[PDB]
Amino acid sequence: IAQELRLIGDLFNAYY
Amino acid sequence: IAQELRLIGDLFNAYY
Amino acid sequence: QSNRELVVDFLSYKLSQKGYSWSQMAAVKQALREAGDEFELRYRRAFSDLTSQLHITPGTAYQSFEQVVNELFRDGVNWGRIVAFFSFGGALCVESVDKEMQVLVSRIAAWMATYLNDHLEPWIQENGGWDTFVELYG
Amino acid sequence: QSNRELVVDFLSYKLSQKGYSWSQMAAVKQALREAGDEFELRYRRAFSDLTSQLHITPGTAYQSFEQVVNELFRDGVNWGRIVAFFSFGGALCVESVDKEMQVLVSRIAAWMATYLNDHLEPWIQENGGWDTFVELYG
């Protein structure tokens, strides 16, 4: 769960 | 506006 | 305290998305949001859109507000009318801002809160409080 | 004060329905609600539903919470991760209650608010505060 949250989290941040 | 609000208002109350 | 506000909000939101409630002050807020949506709908189909009907002359917003409200509860109070009270106030804040009169928004909130406290609260207490309102509007 | 709360809520709601904002503390709350909805979506499609993945052993909820959070921000902080932080906490409150463990809901809120204050706030201040977060998530 921890790694998965980091992924979409980092994908969100890089998206903007 | 006043009479109209009273209508739907009273229709709501009687509905339940 | 701002940080906890953000946490209690969102958590309330996510709990409501699953039919749950953070507190049953939050269920009151939720039920009233939904009620206002339904009211503004059945008002729209039966007549016109509530916000479109609003045409506020400058420096007459208080008089306009107090006139409709005092007439709404002239002969009595009930839950459906209190819903109308909130929706009308909401429509007035939205009609303001639209006409670049944002200053009125805080003033309207003060008019609503004051009228709710002094005039409507006593009725609300005798009729089982806001908890009752949620039962009828589940 | 409960009556004004009901008025500021709803008014915030009705203003948001028309792309307006009561205050830009309310825009933060709004933007964060939406962000959490989008996060929980792209998390679901890419993997599994976040809430389903949760399986809380009794009396281990704090350890479970602190483990994921401390790992999430192990090497840094960013807005997208703070979104994950809220969503995960939200999923945990929803996974609780489901298993009849409502007592945890308030405790989770305390864990989130505390961690937000002590550990995340300093980062938030240096990166232009919560106002910046709203610009990126309009």
Numbering used by the authors:
A (entry chain B), B (entry chain B): 90 to 105
C (entry chain A), D (entry chain A): 3 to 26, 83 to 196
Please share excerpts from the published article on this structure.
In this work we investigate the use of a monosubstituted amino acid in the creation of a hydrocarbon constraint using Bcl-2/BH3 family PPIs as a model. This family of proteins play a pivotal role in the regulation of apoptosis, play a major role in cancer development/progression and represent key targets for anticancer drug-discovery The regulation of apoptosis exploits varying specificity and selectivity of pairwise interactions within the Bcl-2 family interactome. The canonical structural motif involves a BH3 domain from one Bcl-2 family member adopting a helical conformation and binding to a BH3 binding cleft of another partner. In this manuscript we report on the use of a novel α-alkenylglycine derived amino acid to synthesise hydrocarbon constrained BH3-family sequences (BIM and BID).
Constrained BIM peptides were synthesised by replacing 94Arg and 98Glu with non-natural amino acids. The constrained BIM peptides also showed an increase in helicity as determined by CD, with 57% of BIM-DM and 59% helicity within BIM-MM in comparison to the BIM-WT of 20%. In the case of Bcl-xL/BODIPY-BAK, the constrained BIM variants were less potent, IC50 = 320 nM for BIM-WT, IC50 = 11.9 μM for BIM-MM and IC50 = 4 μM BIM-DM. The constraint itself projects out into solvent and does not contribute to the interaction between the peptide and Bcl-xL. When compared to the structure of Bcl-xL bound to BIM-WT and BIM-DM,43 there are no significant differences in the orientation of hot-spot side chains or registry of the peptide – therefore the reason for the drop in potency is not explained by the static structure of the bound complex. The on rate was also altered in this series of peptides, being 10 times slower with BIM-MM and BIM-DM (2.08 × 104 M s–1 compared to 2.3 × 105 M s–1 for BIM-WT). Crystal structures of Mcl-1/BID-MM and Bcl-xL/BIM-MM revealed that the constrained peptides adopt comparable binding conformations when compared to available structures with wild type sequences and/or peptides constrained with the α,α′-disubstituted alkenyl amino acids. Furthermore our structures confirm that the constraints point away from the BH3 binding cleft and do not introduce steric constraints or new non-covalent interactions with the anti-apoptotic partner.
